[PDB]
Structures are given as structure tokens and as C-alpha cells.
């Protein structure tokens, strides 16, 4: 039944000068880089008709396929035992207006089987449809519904495609780069009509674009080479 200690007063460790090793954080992914490279090539060899190219970054493997190669590669990665990606976590997009097909549709698959994640990238334009993966993954029903709402991508084969985020009868797809961040209209309560009405946008304080004062010097270099020494073409050695 001893009285409780006063934890404020108990002695604390004494340290002199602290030492912590400095080493490149990208080194600890070295083993993961080779194994994704091998398994990335394996998918390409199995399906040369579809896999345009594959890429590895640290611990993330990406497979680049055409829109017409989507259902095939998705099915292969779902059913093949060596790569059982039953769970699709994310369906999204990104806008790069400089490219001919601006939208870049990206899928993230999870394999609870082997504890792995794979990424599928497939492009799309404003008018060209993309196959819907809803027949394979039911979890993409709303992720495709969201991508259309914010990017206007036509998804072929979706059972019920409609707005999910923006208001009903909202004009324009917000995440397209050409859509201004403040939109086009705004609402207020009109006394005469006894109802909330839309009016064209008019900001009391116009948005200030401080992004113009960005860096005029390039800030990060060319990077470093971390490709496994088993995935570089050998240099033909000079002759005697």
C-alpha cells in the first residue's frame, strides 16, 4: 500500500551528444526493387499483347496498358494464382492537358494473399470511353462514379453512372485543369422567389495567386541510379 510515486521527481537518463547514422532512405528498398522488377517482367512476358511497359519506384510496381487492354490485364491479375489481386482499392484519374489523351486513369489493386500492391495505369481522352471494371471488382462502382463526376471520363459497362459528389445539374467537371478553383456560379437566398437561387460567381475578395513567385532555379537535381545491376544492358567490353 505504498504511496504512489511522483513521476515528476523520479530520476531521468543523462545523455551527452547524440549520434544518429546518416544513410540514404532509398537504400532500404533495394531488395523490394529487384523482386518487383522480376515480377513486373513476368506479367509482361505472360501478356505481351497488352502490357505496353512496366515501371518500378521504390516499392511500387506500375503496369501501363491501353484502354483496350484493361479488362484483360485486370482479369489476369485477379485470377492468376501467382498474383491474386482480388481487392481493388482505388480508381482515380489525373489531368495532363499537354498530352493528347489528357486523363490518366490509375487503378490500385491489393493482394491480401501475398501481401502485395500493384498499380495499373491506362490513359483516356475526353471523348474516348474506358472499360468499366465493375464486372470484376464491385468496389469500383463508386470510384468510377466519382471519377466521371470530377473528370468526365466515359466508363463503358458501368451499371449506374451518375453524379456522386457535385450537386445535381452541376455544369463542368471540377478536377479538370481548365475548371477554375472557385467554379462558375454561387447560391444565395432570394427574398422575391422565396427560394435559394444560383447566380454567377462574384468574389468580395478575389483570390490572390501567390504561386507566381515560385522558384526560378531548378531545385532538385537529376536524381540517382538505383536500378538493380541485373536489369541493365551490359556494356560490350573493348577488344584487345
Amino acid at each position: 500500500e505504498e504511496p504512489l510515486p511522483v513521476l515528476r521527481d523520479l530520476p531521468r537518463p543523462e545523455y551527452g551528444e547524440l549520434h544518429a547514422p546518416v544513410y540514404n532512405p532509398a537504400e532500404k528498398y533495394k531488395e523490394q526493387i529487384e523482386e518487383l522488377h522480376k515480377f513486373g517482367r513476368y506479367i509482361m512476358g505472360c501478356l505481351p499483347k497488352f502490357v505496353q511497359q512496366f515501371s518500378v519506384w521504390k516499392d511500387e510496381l506500375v503496369i501501363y496498358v491501353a484502354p483496350s487492354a484493361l479488362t484483360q490485364v485486370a482479369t489476369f491479375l485477379k485470377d492468376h494464382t501467382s498474383a491474386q489481386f482480388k481487392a481493388c482499392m482505388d480508381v482515380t484519374a489525373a489531368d495532363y492537358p499537354t498530352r493528347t489523351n489528357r486523363f490518366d486513369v490509375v487503378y490500385n489493386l491489393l493482394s491480401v494473399r501475398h501481401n502485395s500492391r500493384i498499380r495499373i495505369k491506362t490513359y483516356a481522352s475526353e471523348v474516348s470511353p474506358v472499360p468499366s471494371v465493375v464486372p470484376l471488382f464491385q468496389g469500383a462502382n463508386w470510384f468510377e462514379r466519382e471519377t466521371y463526376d470530377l473528370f468526365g471520363i466515359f466508363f463503358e459497362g458501368h451499371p449506374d453512372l451518375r453524379r456522386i459528389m457535385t450537386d445535381y445539374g452541376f455544369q463542368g467537371h471540377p478536377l479538370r485543369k481548365d475548371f477554375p478553383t472557385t467554379g462558375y456560379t454561387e447560391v444565395r437566398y432570394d427574398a422575391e422567389k422565396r427560394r435559394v437561387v444560383y447566380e454567377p460567381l462574384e468574389l468580395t475578395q478575389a483570390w490572390r495567386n501567390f504561386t507566381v513567385g515560385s522558384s526560378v532555379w531548378e531545385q532538385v537535381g537529376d536524381g540517382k541510379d538505383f536500378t538493380p545491376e541485373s536489369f541493365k544492358l551490359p556494356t560490350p567490353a573493348p577488344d584487345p
Binding site: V127, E156, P159, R162, R163, Y168, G169, K193, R195, Y198
Partner: protein, 115 residues
């Protein structure tokens, strides 16, 4: 999982003629529900004008030539119908849709700041 009421599958049509049959079919579906649109949305105008303004918006796109433009304008064509039937829009939105409204002389625009 099952789709909601008045839903349709999203298929990219590849024939021009096939689309017009869908386009013409959809037009009566708008026309058929016009009285219910007034009743459900408590519109202050008779259903005749509701049928009147539906037709105009179809013609606005009549002269598109390229096919990929035709589908997307049809894909979004169905979506606006589906929301209207299921009472998803509020009364404020529908009123303002049909409550919408000659340009001033050069002096008049100049006098008031123009654009």
C-alpha cells in the same frame, strides 16, 4: 448490389442510326412524365410549357457530326432524365431551370460599362 430506379447501362454506341432511335425514344419518356414533373415539383406553369422547353434542348445538339461527341451527349442525356424522375433535384433547381428570363445599343453598353 442493384441499380436504382429508371437506370440504364452505359454503352458506347458505334452506329449513328442506332443512337437516334435511343434519342427519339428518350424524348417521349421526357414528354410522358411531364404532368408528373409539374405535380411532383409543384411547378407554377401548366405541363404544356414543360413539354415545350424539353423539345428545344434536343434540337440544340441536332447537327453534331462526329460520333464520339454523339455518345457523351447521349450518356449525359440519360443522366439528367434519371435524376428528374426520381425526385433527386429539389424544387428550387427545377423552378430555376424553367424560370430563365434584345441587346442594348452600342451607346447603352458604353454608357453602363459594357463588358
Amino acid at each position: 448490389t442493384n441499380p436504382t430506379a429508371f437506370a440504364q447501362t452505359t454503352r458506347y454506341v458505334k452506329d449513328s442510326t442506332e443512337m437516334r432511335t435511343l434519342v427519339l425514344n428518350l424524348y417521349r419518356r421526357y414528354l410522358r412524365h411531364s404532368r408528373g414533373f409539374v405535380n411532383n415539383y409543384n411547378l407554377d406553369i401548366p405541363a404544356s410549357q414543360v413539354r415545350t422547353k424539353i423539345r428545344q434542348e434536343f434540337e440544340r445538339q441536332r447537327f453534331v457530326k462526329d460520333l464520339p461527341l454523339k455518345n457523351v451527349l447521349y450518356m449525359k442525356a440519360q443522366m439528367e432524365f434519371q435524376e428528374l424522375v426520381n425526385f433527386w433535384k429539389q424544387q428550387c433547381h427545377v423552378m430555376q431551370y424553367f424560370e430563365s428570363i434584345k441587346g442594348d445599343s452600342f451607346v447603352q453598353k458604353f454608357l453602363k460599362g459594357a463588358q
